[PDB]
């Protein structure tokens, strides 16, 4: 049985978010929580909140036992991009992409 949670339009670049997701994909929930708490990257607290929300609805909506759950899926899709500019020398402007991520966590009991 599976439970899902999504954080949509997090203002962090998907490349960056996926660096951290690659660490927790497929691990036990408690180990993943520890990894996120002790990994020093900007997306760790956000990913942690997605994971805790998924575990919470595993417990509440599906009465799953949270101590048997594994991170079955973890991934970041691209959200809409905020388009910005930076003034450069000699009157020119250059684009700045403030990218966003949709972060999905799926936890599973394997049954």
Q: Does 84 sit near RNA (CB under 7 A)?
A: no
**Residue among 38 and 89 whose Cβ is closer to another protein:** 38
Task: Kindly tell me the burial class for residue 45, based on how many C-beta atoms sit within 10 Å of its own C-beta (0-12, 13-18, 19 or more).
Answer: exposed
**Residue among 19 and 56 whose Cβ is closer to another protein:** 19
- In the region spanning residues 30 to 49, those forming contacts with another protein, defined by CB under 8 A, are 31, 34-35, 37-41
Q: Is the dihedral of CA 49, 38, 41, 13 positive or negative?
A: negative
DSSP E strand stretches across the chain: 2-10, 70-78, 82-87, 93-98, 101-108
The interface region with RNA, picked from 7-15, 31-39, 63-71, 86-94 by CB under 7 A, is 7-15
**Residue among 4 and 18 whose Cβ is closer to another protein:** 18
């Amino acid at each position: 049985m599976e439970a899902k949670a999504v954080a949509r339009t997090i203002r962090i670049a998907p490349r960056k978010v996926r660096l951290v997701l690659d660490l927790i994909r497929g691990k036990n929930a408690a180990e993943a929580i520890a990894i996120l708490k002790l990994t020093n990257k900007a997306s760790s607290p956000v990913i942690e909140k997605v994971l805790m929300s998924a575990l919470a609805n595993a417990e509440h909506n599906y009465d799953m036992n949270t101590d048997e759950l594994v991170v079955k899926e973890a991934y970041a899709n691209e959200g809409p991009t905020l388009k910005r500019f930076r003034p450069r020398a000699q009157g020119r402007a250059s684009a700045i992409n403030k990218r966003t991520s949709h972060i999905t966590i799926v936890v599973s009991d394997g049954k």
